Design a protein around this nucleic acid. Structure first.
Ligand SMILES: [Mg+2]
Ligand SMILES: [Mg+2]
Ligand SMILES: [Mg+2]
Ligand SMILES: [Mg+2]
Ligand SMILES: [Mg+2]
Ligand SMILES: [Mg+2]
Ligand SMILES: [Mg+2]
Ligand SMILES: [Mg+2]
Ligand SMILES: [Mg+2]
Ligand SMILES: [Mg+2]
Ligand SMILES: [Mg+2]
Ligand SMILES: [Mg+2]
Ligand SMILES: [Mg+2]
Ligand SMILES: [Mg+2]
Ligand SMILES: [Mg+2]
Ligand SMILES: [Mg+2]
Ligand SMILES: [Mg+2]
Ligand SMILES: [Mg+2]
Ligand SMILES: [Mg+2]
Ligand SMILES: [Mg+2]
Ligand SMILES: [Mg+2]
Ligand SMILES: [Mg+2]
Ligand SMILES: [Mg+2]
Ligand SMILES: [Mg+2]
Ligand SMILES: [Mg+2]
Ligand SMILES: [Mg+2]
Ligand SMILES: [Mg+2]
Lengths: 48, 109
RNA sequence: GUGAACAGCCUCUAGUUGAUAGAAUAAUGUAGAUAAGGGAAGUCGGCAAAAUAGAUCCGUAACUUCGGGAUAAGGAUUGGC
RNA sequence: UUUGCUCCACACAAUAUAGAUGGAUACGAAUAAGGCGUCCUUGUGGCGUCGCUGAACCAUAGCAGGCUAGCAACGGUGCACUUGGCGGAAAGGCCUUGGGUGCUUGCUGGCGAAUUGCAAUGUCAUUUUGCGUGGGGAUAAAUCAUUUGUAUACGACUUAGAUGUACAACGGGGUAUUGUAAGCAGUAGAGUAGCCUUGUUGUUACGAUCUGCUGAGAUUAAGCCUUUGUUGUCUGAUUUGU
């Protein structure tokens, strides 16, 4: 916890996120969910 | 105890030569493969088949295959007991691709 | 063999595989490379580096001792079948 | 590792000591002001006294302090116990309750001392450390090596390893990179050249390339994530005690 009571305005701003990047970091991630990968690429040679 | 076996292992040479200086990659494989026969069955004294050597050097200093399927027999030492009483003989198993094989006990007869 | 070629690169005959070796990959090095945007603002000074480069066709200034300058410059092209 | 180890008693042989030889004796505060006593209206109060130094207070007599008999006190003091409490600034100490026990120089007696020869030379204090006994007690870890890579020149750092919710080696899945593998097939393909029954699709050879199976195949921890699978592994070395 802070050692002091900051009133930075920058420190009183209540924040609410709109979206959280959830792509792969192990590479240039394109998709957020396995769901989304499917919907976009369609059915592959594996699967079904 | 220490009992004679003979299993068939597939080694990932690639992740072990990853980064190695080209002139040193085949010789690292000989050394790295010895280190592998020692891991399974801490035999310490390891001998390689000269077919394995060829097999390793099959594509030059620089181009060691990413995976090798190996046969490794732990055996009984003969003559004036060179410290430990057991070898590992190592040799190449003929197979199309060394991908996708698990490790297997070879039943001896 | 490629190619203008006794070049460079690869091979045959013949000959070597001989230059202490093992384990790691801190700094700083010696040798080799690459950098977004800018493009000599660096520096005594473009030093170092970079860029150009074969060949075919077109094209080609001042000046000149008429021989040159001149591959001046500036362009297009190039595999395979 | 065979010896061990720990606390308390009293017992020897070493060993050391910045220097025992009646007592380090506890308000706070002011100083052009205070202490102590006493009363009170508990206050910047009233009265009394003190300093002018600790030249004080306390203790001190007994073979380096012996042996012995009594009176008077009901006290003093030492020791080992015991009842309550308080003390954290480094409290490791302080007050308090109950007996027990030795001493008592408060007082009155009976003995002792020499010859250590006229001073040298004489009370033994407390540190450690090893051994000895008798009792109570407790029954681990660190390092080497091997391993991780949140670490690293080497040392060092950080993980892991004795049957596990373990660890490794492989396999699987997810993640990523590239850009569509080998093989087979095509009345795809600029065309040329053969041969026949000379073409309601004529075949045969040669042919960059194209198309399909094929966002296919290859690679993916080496410092990526993950696992109902397979197989394997799991007590070598060394060192340490108040
Ligand atoms: Mg990334
Ligand atoms: Mg590297
Ligand atoms: Mg080679
Ligand atoms: Mg010649
Ligand atoms: Mg050369
Ligand atoms: Mg010669
Ligand atoms: Mg030399
Ligand atoms: Mg640049
Ligand atoms: Mg420019
Ligand atoms: Mg300047
Ligand atoms: Mg300058
Ligand atoms: Mg300048
Ligand atoms: Mg230059
Ligand atoms: Mg460039
Ligand atoms: Mg052309
Ligand atoms: Mg007064
Ligand atoms: Mg007064
Ligand atoms: Mg006094
Ligand atoms: Mg005496
Ligand atoms: Mg102190
Ligand atoms: Mg004297
Ligand atoms: Mg690291
Ligand atoms: Mg697990
Ligand atoms: Mg294993
Ligand atoms: Mg495709
Ligand atoms: Mg699991
Ligand atoms: Mg198992």
């Amino acid at each position: 916890k802070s050692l002091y009571t900051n009133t930075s305005r920058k420190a009183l701003e209540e924040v609410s996120l709109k979206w959280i990047d959830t792509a792969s970091k192990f590479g240039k991630g394109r998709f957020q969910t396995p769901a989304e990968k499917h919907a976009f690429m369609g059915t592959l040679k594996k699967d079904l | 105890l220490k009992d004679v076996v003979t299993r068939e292992y597939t080694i990932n040479l690639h992740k072990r030569l990853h980064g190695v200086s080209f002139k040193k990659r085949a010789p690292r494989a000989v050394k790295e493969i010895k280190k592998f026969a020692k891991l399974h069955m801490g035999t310490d004294d390891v001998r390689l088949a000269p077919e394995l050597n060829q097999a390793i050097w099959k594509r030059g200093v620089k181009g060691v295959e990413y995976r090798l399927r190996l046969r490794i027999s732990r055996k009984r030492n003969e003559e004036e007991d060179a410290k430990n009483p057991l070898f590992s003989y190592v040799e190449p198993v003929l197979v199309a691709s060394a991908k996708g094989l698990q490790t297997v006990v070879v039943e001896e007869d």
